Amino acid sequence: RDNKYDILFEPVRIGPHIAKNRFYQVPHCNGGGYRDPSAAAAMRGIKSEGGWGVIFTEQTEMHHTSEITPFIELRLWEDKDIPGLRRMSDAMKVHGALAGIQLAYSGINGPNFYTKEVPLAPSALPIRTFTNDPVQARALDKQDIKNLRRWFVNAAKRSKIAGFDLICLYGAHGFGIFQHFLSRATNQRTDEYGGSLENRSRFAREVVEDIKEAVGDTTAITMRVSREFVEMNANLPDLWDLAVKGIRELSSKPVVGVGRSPDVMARMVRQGVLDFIGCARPSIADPFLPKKIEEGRIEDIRECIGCNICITGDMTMSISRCTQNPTFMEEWRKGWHPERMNAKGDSNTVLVVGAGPAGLEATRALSLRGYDVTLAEATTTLGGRVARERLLPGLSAWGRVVDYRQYQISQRTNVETYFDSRLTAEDVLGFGFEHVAIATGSHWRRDGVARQHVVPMPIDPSMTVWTPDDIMAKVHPENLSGKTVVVYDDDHYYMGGVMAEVMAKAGAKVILVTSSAYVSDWTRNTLEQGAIHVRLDDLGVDIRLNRGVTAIRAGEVETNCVYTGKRSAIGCDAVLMVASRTSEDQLFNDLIARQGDWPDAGIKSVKIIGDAAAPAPIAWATYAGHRYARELDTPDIGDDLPFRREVTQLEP
Amino acid sequence: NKYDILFEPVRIGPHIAKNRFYQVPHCNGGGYRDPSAAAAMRGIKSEGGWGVIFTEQTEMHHTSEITPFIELRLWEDKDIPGLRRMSDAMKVHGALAGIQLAYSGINGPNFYTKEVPLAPSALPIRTFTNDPVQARALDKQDIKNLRRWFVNAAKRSKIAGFDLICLYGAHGFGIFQHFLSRATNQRTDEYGGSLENRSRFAREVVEDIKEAVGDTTAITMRVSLDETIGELGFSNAEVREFVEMNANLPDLWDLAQGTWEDCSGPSRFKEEGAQEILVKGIRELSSKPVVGVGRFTSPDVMARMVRQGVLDFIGCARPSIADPFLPKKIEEGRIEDIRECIGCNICITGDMTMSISRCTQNPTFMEEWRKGWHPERMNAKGDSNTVLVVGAGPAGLEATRALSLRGYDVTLAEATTTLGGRVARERLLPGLSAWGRVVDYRQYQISQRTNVETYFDSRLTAEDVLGFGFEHVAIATGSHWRRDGVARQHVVPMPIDPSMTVWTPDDIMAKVHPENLSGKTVVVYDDDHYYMGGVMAEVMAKAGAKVILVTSSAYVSDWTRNTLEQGAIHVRLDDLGVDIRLNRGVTAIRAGEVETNCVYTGKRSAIGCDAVLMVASRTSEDQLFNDLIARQGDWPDAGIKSVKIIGDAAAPAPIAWATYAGHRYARELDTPDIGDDLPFRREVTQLEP
Numbered sequence A: 001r002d003n004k005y006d007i008l009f010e011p012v013r014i015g016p017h018i019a020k021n022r023f024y025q026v027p028h029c030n031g032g033g034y035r036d037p038s039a040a041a042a043m044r045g046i047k048s049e050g051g052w053g054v055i056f057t058e059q060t061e062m063h064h065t066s067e068i069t070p071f072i073e074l075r076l077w078e079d080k081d082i083p084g085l086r087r088m089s090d091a092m093k094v095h096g097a098l099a100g101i102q103l104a105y106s107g108i109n110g111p112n113f114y115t116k117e118v119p120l121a122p123s124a125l126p127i128r129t130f131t132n133d134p135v136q137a138r139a140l141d142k143q144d145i146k147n148l149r150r151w152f153v154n155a156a157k158r159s160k161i162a163g164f165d166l167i168c169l170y171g172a173h174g175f176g177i178f179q180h181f182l183s184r185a186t187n188q189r190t191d192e193y194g195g196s197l198e199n200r201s202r203f204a205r206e207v208v209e210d211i212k213e214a215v216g217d218t219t220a221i222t223m224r225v226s227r228e229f230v231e232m233n234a235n236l237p238d239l240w241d242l243a244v245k246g247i248r249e250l251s252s253k254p255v256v257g258v259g260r261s262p263d264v265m266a267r268m269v270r271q272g273v274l275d276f277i278g279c280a281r282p283s284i285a286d287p288f289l290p291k292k293i294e295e296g297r298i299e300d301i302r303e304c305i306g307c308n309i310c311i312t313g314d315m316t317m318s319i320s321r322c323t324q325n326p327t328f329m330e331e332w333r334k335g336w337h338p339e340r341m342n343a344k345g346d347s348n349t350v351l352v353v354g355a356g357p358a359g360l361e362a363t364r365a366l367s368l369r370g371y372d373v374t375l376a377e378a379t380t381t382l383g384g385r386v387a388r389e390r391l392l393p394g395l396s397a398w399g400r401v402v403d404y405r406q407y408q409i410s411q412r413t414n415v416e417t418y419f420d421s422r423l424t425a426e427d428v429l430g431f432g433f434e435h436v437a438i439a440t441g442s443h444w445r446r447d448g449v450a451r452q453h454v455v456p457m458p459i460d461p462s463m464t465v466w467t468p469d470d471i472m473a474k475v476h477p478e479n480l481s482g483k484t485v486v487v488y489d490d491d492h493y494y495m496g497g498v499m500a501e502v503m504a505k506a507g508a509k510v511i512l513v514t515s516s517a518y519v520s521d522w523t524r525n526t527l528e529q530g531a532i533h534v535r536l537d538d539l540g541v542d543i544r545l546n547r548g549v550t551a552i553r554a555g556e557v558e559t560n561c562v563y564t565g566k567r568s569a570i571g572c573d574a575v576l577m578v579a580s581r582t583s584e585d586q587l588f589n590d591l592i593a594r595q596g597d598w599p600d601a602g603i604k605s606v607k608i609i610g611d612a613a614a615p616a617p618i619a620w621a622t623y624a625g626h627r628y629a630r631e632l633d634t635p636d637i638g639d640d641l642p643f644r645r646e647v648t649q650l651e652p
Numbered sequence B: 001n002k003y004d005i006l007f008e009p010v011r012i013g014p015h016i017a018k019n020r021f022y023q024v025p026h027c028n029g030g031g032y033r034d035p036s037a038a039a040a041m042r043g044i045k046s047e048g049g050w051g052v053i054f055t056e057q058t059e060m061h062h063t064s065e066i067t068p069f070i071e072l073r074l075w076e077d078k079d080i081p082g083l084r085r086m087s088d089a090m091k092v093h094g095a096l097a098g099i100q101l102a103y104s105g106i107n108g109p110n111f112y113t114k115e116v117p118l119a120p121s122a123l124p125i126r127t128f129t130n131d132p133v134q135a136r137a138l139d140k141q142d143i144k145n146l147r148r149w150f151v152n153a154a155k156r157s158k159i160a161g162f163d164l165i166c167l168y169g170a171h172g173f174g175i176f177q178h179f180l181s182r183a184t185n186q187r188t189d190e191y192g193g194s195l196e197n198r199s200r201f202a203r204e205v206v207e208d209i210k211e212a213v214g215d216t217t218a219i220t221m222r223v224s225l226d227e228t229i230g231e232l233g234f235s236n237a238e239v240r241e242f243v244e245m246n247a248n249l250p251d252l253w254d255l256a257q258g259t260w261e262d263c264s265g266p267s268r269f270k271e272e273g274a275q276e277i278l279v280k281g282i283r284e285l286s287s288k289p290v291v292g293v294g295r296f297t298s299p300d301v302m303a304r305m306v307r308q309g310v311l312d313f314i315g316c317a318r319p320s321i322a323d324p325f326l327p328k329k330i331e332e333g334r335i336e337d338i339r340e341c342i343g344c345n346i347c348i349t350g351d352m353t354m355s356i357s358r359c360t361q362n363p364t365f366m367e368e369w370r371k372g373w374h375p376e377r378m379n380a381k382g383d384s385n386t387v388l389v390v391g392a393g394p395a396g397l398e399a400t401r402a403l404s405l406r407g408y409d410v411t412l413a414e415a416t417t418t419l420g421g422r423v424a425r426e427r428l429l430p431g432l433s434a435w436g437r438v439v440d441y442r443q444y445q446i447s448q449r450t451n452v453e454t455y456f457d458s459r460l461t462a463e464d465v466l467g468f469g470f471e472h473v474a475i476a477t478g479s480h481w482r483r484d485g486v487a488r489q490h491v492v493p494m495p496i497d498p499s500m501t502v503w504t505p506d507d508i509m510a511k512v513h514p515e516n517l518s519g520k521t522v523v524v525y526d527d528d529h530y531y532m533g534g535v536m537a538e539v540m541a542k543a544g545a546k547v548i549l550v551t552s553s554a555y556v557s558d559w560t561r562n563t564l565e566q567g568a569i570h571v572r573l574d575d576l577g578v579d580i581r582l583n584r585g586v587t588a589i590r591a592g593e594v595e596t597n598c599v600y601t602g603k604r605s606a607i608g609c610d611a612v613l614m615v616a617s618r619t620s621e622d623q624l625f626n627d628l629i630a631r632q633g634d635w636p637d638a639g640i641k642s643v644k645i646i647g648d649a650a651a652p653a654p655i656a657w658a659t660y661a662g663h664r665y666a667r668e669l670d671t672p673d674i675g676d677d678l679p680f681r682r683e684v685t686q687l688e689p
């Protein structure tokens, strides 16, 4: 390990504790929370193995009078909640990390749909959520504030019993009661908790003092904030968690910061900017990031691509995925691990057909298991859809999905890669490899079928119609000045907006038509949706919402208002159709059709994975490839579940 | 009576239902998370006299599931203890116990399990939220597996104690609908094409299940009565041919609408009995009994459906939530005591927000296990004797009703001459008349009580309250719509030129505006995002105004997506000529115009108008409470032991929060201090070892 990285492995004090290094996994959600607690705990345990010196839970609701159901985070309302949390703290500490819990009172962000308590805030206003929920908060009175302090102390004591070394008060992102007292928008009080900055930070100071009094002898208190608050409270917590100028200059307390390169980390510390390197998503993509820097294996780091698929798992309450790391939140469920494969079985040879994200991850994971792997790719480029999409506006970071796998595979002696090999069933049978994985991808459809239409729509064949594949292959003229292009987006994730930007940059007049109330609808779950709308408007794109396309005509499209059914035409010179995709499965069907020749050929099994099985986002393809590698040679489970799961404990 | 027909027994396969009252499968916002709450709620239906009681849909396989929605699961043996608690509760009082089994098919994205979704034909998944995944087409072995998975679930269901299994195929949802519909089933093998092929899957599953458990278990099929997808929807006419062709397939036909939006008809858009046309005649096609729904709250409608041969069973979901004792009250000749469903669909919002459902009419719904509440029994009076309830809105009325049933001497003081507060005013607005049943139920119930005195024209002051010497006071004094534009977009007052005419919903409800607005343009600024804005726009339109509705949301009446009213509201407003401006706030009200902002870009533009109908948010009427708190030192001499504030006067919210708050007050009076303990029970996850 190069000496410029040694500073990252110096110990750092946090209140009564010492962290073994500067790698600090900040609180982050995972889609399991209080529903899937053994999954969350084991995931935290993998961070412990990975070398993180500090590990935090997601936010934990510390009282039944404020909660944000349907979101699933953690709860610490009663003694019942301690065992699940104790399992998490235990896992954090096995390999030397400090165990942290984040406590939250959502305040004016919590409608209390589950508990049905009256919501409480500094001032009486409508609740503030993503979804315009139809309830208001009551203004806290003085006795409420005393209770709220007591409730935080109660949760701190339970946190000690649950085995946590650090408590973080969630006061960032405009979320929670600490932000609400600090903000003059939400805190319009005129008593001693409002008005002056000293009054607006009184609650925060009273909570911290009360917690220090109760457990400060064994437990550190951190404050996470998103700045005169500094001069006045420089030494209030044991640690400032920033989600700088004065905190560094006025406070004797350590600081952690986040910001999605070991050289940058070391410089931030060397230059006196940070004491701790805070990470959420980089630790999800690579839980062993600290360990790989410690051992000088910087070339083996799996980089976050910033797709925010992990966030969609919290927004859909469904256990988060990571595009780069398919083992994320599958450690307890399936025994998967980001740096260890299960032992090789009895078979020896595998053919992987197609070098997209699915085939690439299958190849990487199988070779690490010990199989001899041949990867056949029909074109002269690795990466499949990622090699093509990475060239589109705003998607270049996704190339790390290929580059990581290309690099890892290049280091393996048990992998051979063939380009220009569009395999037939005859080819595959001739090779006599024992197991075949068909990862042959998919194509965007030309017949308009997706959601609005389930059978081909009326299309005049004189209209120019491009799919995203045509655009990626540069079928369209480089210069579209003078032309109007309707982008029909019945996909509702990212491709429609990306295609509209390609057309915009080519000089077209661009009209984006989507049946949804939102452009790039599902990117609401990645929190990107607002910025996408603004970029398209800045590009001059004309956004037509709540509007389907019922027919493509000679010089126009017919459209429908999705509520009323009323129809109207939009003139255009071409239609860029972003409908849905059809699996490329002919080769698989050809091999299944000749299943009888397999034994003679030496083929034991043929499976179809990734987009060739069922089109989905890229993270589903890396997942399917990893799953194929994990399941090869494992025994039949019949009708058993391939994952563990916990259910509700019946009260007696 | 004409109602005797409703209590005749009816055979369902090997079982006999003791009467014709049939609780169709319905969700509750608890499901697999809060199974003891769901179980106890089913037990109350048993007490109430239902002859058949069903669970909500239960996912019978891990390769198809609809997370984040929380229904039930039957994937493993682990799942059986919770279901057995439900079937046990169903049967205590003689109901048959039914479980509904579902395979969501092209509707199930598998976000939780990460299995590949499966469907008859390969298409994008079809959900509310445009999820970015597609289903793979079932192959023959998949179909054999799926049948086996249904058999496995049927066997687990028998072990869990259920008498009936319902195969879920309604609301356009699930694999049985998907095989029947030519839109979703484009196969060319023997499971596609002809109606006979498209119903092959159903025949094979039913046969397989009967073979396994048919000696002790009846099978019902819940069917979509109509579907529209281009020209390929499974039409009501086609449904009729399916039934005729398969007349002896299930033990019972459970008939429901082809979308949830259509089936759980809001009272604002659908009258009672709305599915009769879709259903009439079907009974003639099969010799198996038929259940249907229609927001049945009128016993006369119920008896007619059976007498005129439309239905064998009166199916109820929401009427049984609002009044779980509806069958017993008809049996005992207390029709006047029925708590009628108002068709607000607040119960559905609990499923859509995964949060345990409320009922506007029945605040005890899904609080039976959590808090010991019961729709027809109050806890016994404690040691105190007198209670003053100030305000006769939904909150004060429910507190009064429930307190009198505990035995307290209750005085109810109301400032106006009318009972009902906001409901007495809102019930007169377009489409909200059925919501008036919230007042009428409570008004009637209180009129039968000898321990309640009601004072009108009595706007109480704190001095009045101290003078009366009642032991406990509940301040239920409501709220007012704000005139300063504050809600969500603005948290402090917006710029408002005082020369512009600005009406709030209170003004409109008081007829402050001219009855005839022909020739005038009215901007409705909706920053409330539930129902009032759209209702106000309809009032203005009906008065003849040119109406422009401006809202910062991407949807008109945004939160009514959770009540399933949203689409019909948009269509109604468009039909009325309302000009709907979405994704647009109001930044200022000027002399003859409002300034608006595109919420994404910030770009500003003005809209001319003669008046602004401001639908912002509400401010609690809490002066009286504050005055009394300020004089807390005088309470002991005055004899006052406690003063609490409830309902909109505490924190404005929908009407159901107010009936909830009143009931909660009545339930908690004189109860022991719990300290920092929870006032409700709750279950947590069972840790695996």
Ligand SMILES: *c1c(C)c(C)cc2c1nc1c(=O)[nH]c(=O)nc-1n2C[C@H](O)[C@H](O)[C@H](O)COP(=O)(O)O
Pocket: A026, A027, A028, A029, A030, A057, A058, A059, A073, A102, A170, A172, A224, A243, A258, A259, A260, A278, A279, A280, A281, A282, A310, A311, A314, A320
């Ligand atoms: C949820 C998830 C899934 C992620 C990616 C972010 C997130 C999540 N939950 C959080 C929580 O419960 N409490 C909290 O304080 N912050 C939470 N975050 C934000 C996260 O801590 C980081 O601040 C951001 O992810 C940015 O840092 P980085 O990811 O670039 O390293």
Ligand SMILES: *c1c(C)c(C)cc2c1nc1c(=O)[nH]c(=O)nc-1n2C[C@H](O)[C@H](O)[C@H](O)COP(=O)(O)O
Pocket: B024, B025, B026, B027, B028, B055, B056, B057, B071, B100, B168, B170, B222, B256, B263, B264, B265, B293, B294, B295, B296, B315, B316, B317, B318, B319, B347, B348, B351, B357
């Ligand atoms: C949930 C809820 C909250 C309601 C009101 C209806 C609903 C819900 N869950 C259902 C389920 O899980 N399976 C099923 O088949 N139907 C479900 N429904 C619909 C309900 O069964 C009724 O069909 C409608 O509500 C109409 O009947 P009614 O309420 O007018 O009597």
Ligand SMILES: Nc1ncnc2c1ncn2[C@@H]1O[C@H](COP(=O)(O)OP(=O)(O)O)[C@@H](O)[C@H]1O
Pocket: A353, A354, A355, A356, A357, A358, A359, A376, A377, A378, A379, A383, A384, A385, A386, A421, A422, A423, A424, A439, A440, A441, A442, A584, A587, A609, A610, A611, A612, A618, A621
């Ligand atoms: N018959 C074939 N033989 C070899 N490679 C193929 C064949 N058919 C398609 N391919 C390749 O398979 C890959 C499919 O990858 P992609 O579309 O990204 O799928 P996924 O997202 O499922 O990984 C492409 O790189 C494509 O060139």
Ligand SMILES: Nc1ncnc2c1ncn2[C@@H]1O[C@H](COP(=O)(O)OP(=O)(O)O)[C@@H](O)[C@H]1O
Pocket: B390, B391, B392, B393, B394, B395, B396, B413, B414, B415, B416, B420, B421, B422, B423, B458, B459, B460, B461, B476, B477, B478, B479, B621, B624, B646, B647, B648, B649, B655, B658
């Ligand atoms: N000082 C008072 N004394 C008696 N009644 C009052 C007083 N102030 C307001 N009210 C009444 O209280 C009721 C409030 O009802 P409402 O606004 O519907 O509240 P909620 O929805 O909380 O029940 C109204 O009927 C109103 O006339």
Ligand code: SF4
Pocket: A281, A282, A284, A285, A303, A304, A305, A306, A307, A308, A309, A310, A311, A321, A322, A323, A324, A325
């Ligand atoms: S899902 Fe995407 S953004 Fe989140 S950690 Fe993985 S690669 Fe990074």
Ligand code: SF4
Pocket: B317, B318, B319, B321, B322, B340, B341, B342, B343, B344, B345, B346, B347, B348, B358, B359, B360, B361, B362
């Ligand atoms: S919430 Fe409304 S619609 Fe649902 S059962 Fe109760 S009164 Fe009926």
